[PDB]
DNA sequence: CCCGAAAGTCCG
DNA sequence: CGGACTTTCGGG
């Protein structure tokens, strides 16, 4: 069965723009796990819309099939277009979509698509559907795969007012002890967003809870200010 | 335009 | 370790 022809119009328009002497730095910048077309984001956004504009956006019911397609192509540019047509479709992605996400999570992993799929698509999903987060969370803690990790750390980042504290708080306390630095800044990360709506519980927290190292600076990085450096 | 964020390198 | 610096991106 032939690659979908939005998919394949889209292959053709991104190899005809690119440009090898950029995808040098930009495959370097993601430590050469991928390779890389060399195309940046306002144009690979335009030549997308190009695309849209010529065939228009499929219909739905291939969502999931052009968001596979362009999952399995090398050059890391068709994650990043496929994860803007996600977007695209945001209005029609739901509950059920939890282990289509998941699984988009563990496949060609790295910080760039998982922290564009994990604190949006899934933020929003556990904000509407917060019974769900049980029958997630405590499976991507456990799991072997640091970015499931990093999801069940970062699924409440842009939460500010609606962020669960007291589950926040024990999801960090399962991870804090982790070597991993994609694990152990996303705790900071947390940390340091959240402190900017509850600044005195990120500050109690940091100060009679263990962390890396890492983890405590990035956190209060900001907040530092506000109550000062003890001597 | 600005600022803050993921990263990233380089240095002591 | 952690500070200083860098580019790219998203959002005032």
Same mark, same amino acid.
């Given at each position: /069965?032939? !690659? ?9 328009? =991104? ?5 090898? &002497? @950029?995808? &040098?730095?930009?495959? +370097? ?6 390779? =890389? ?6 144009? +690979? +956004?335009?030549? #997308?819309?190009? *695309? ?13 099939? *052009?968001?596979?397609? #362009? ?5 890391? &540019? =068709? ?6 047509? !996600? ?18 999570? /563990? ?6 698509? /998982? ?5 949006? =698509?899934?933020?929003? *999903? ?8 049980? $029958? ?17 750390? #970062? ?7 609606? !962020? ?18 994609? *694990?152990?800044? $996303? ?18 927290? /940091?100060? %009679?809870?263990?962390?890396?190292? #890492?983890?405590?600076? &990035?956190?209060?990085?900001?907040? @530092? ?5 003890? %001597?």
């Amino acid at each position: /069965v032939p !690659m979908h022809p939005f998919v394949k119009a889209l292959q053709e328009h =991104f190899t005809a723009h690119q440009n090898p &002497e @950029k995808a &040098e730095p930009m495959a +370097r910048y993601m430590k050469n796990h991928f390779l =890389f077309l060399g195309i940046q984001t306002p144009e +690979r +956004r335009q030549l #997308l819309k190009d *695309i849209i504009q010529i065939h228009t956006l499929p219909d739905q019911k291939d969502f999931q099939i *052009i968001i596979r397609e #362009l999952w399995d192509l090398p050059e890391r &540019e =068709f994650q990043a277009a496929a994860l803007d047509i !996600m977007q695209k479709y945001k209005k029609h992605i739901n509950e059920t979509h939890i282990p289509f996400l998941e699984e988009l999570i /563990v496949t060609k992993s790295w910080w760039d698509s /998982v922290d564009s799929i994990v604190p949006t =698509f899934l933020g929003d *999903i556990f904000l509407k559907h917060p019974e769900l987060i049980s $029958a997630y969370i405590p499976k991507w803690i456990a799991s072997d795969n640091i970015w499931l990790q990093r999801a069940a750390i #970062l699924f409440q980042l842009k939460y500010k007012q609606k !962020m669960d504290e007291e589950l926040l708080f024990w999801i960090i306390g399962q991870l804090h002890s982790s070597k991993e630095f994609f *694990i152990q800044k $996303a705790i900071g990360w947390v940390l340091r967003e959240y402190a900017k709506t509850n600044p005195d519980v990120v500050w109690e927290y /940091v100060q %009679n809870n263990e962390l890396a190292p #890492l983890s405590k600076r &990035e956190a209060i990085k900001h907040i @530092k200010q506000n109550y000062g450096i003890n %001597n």
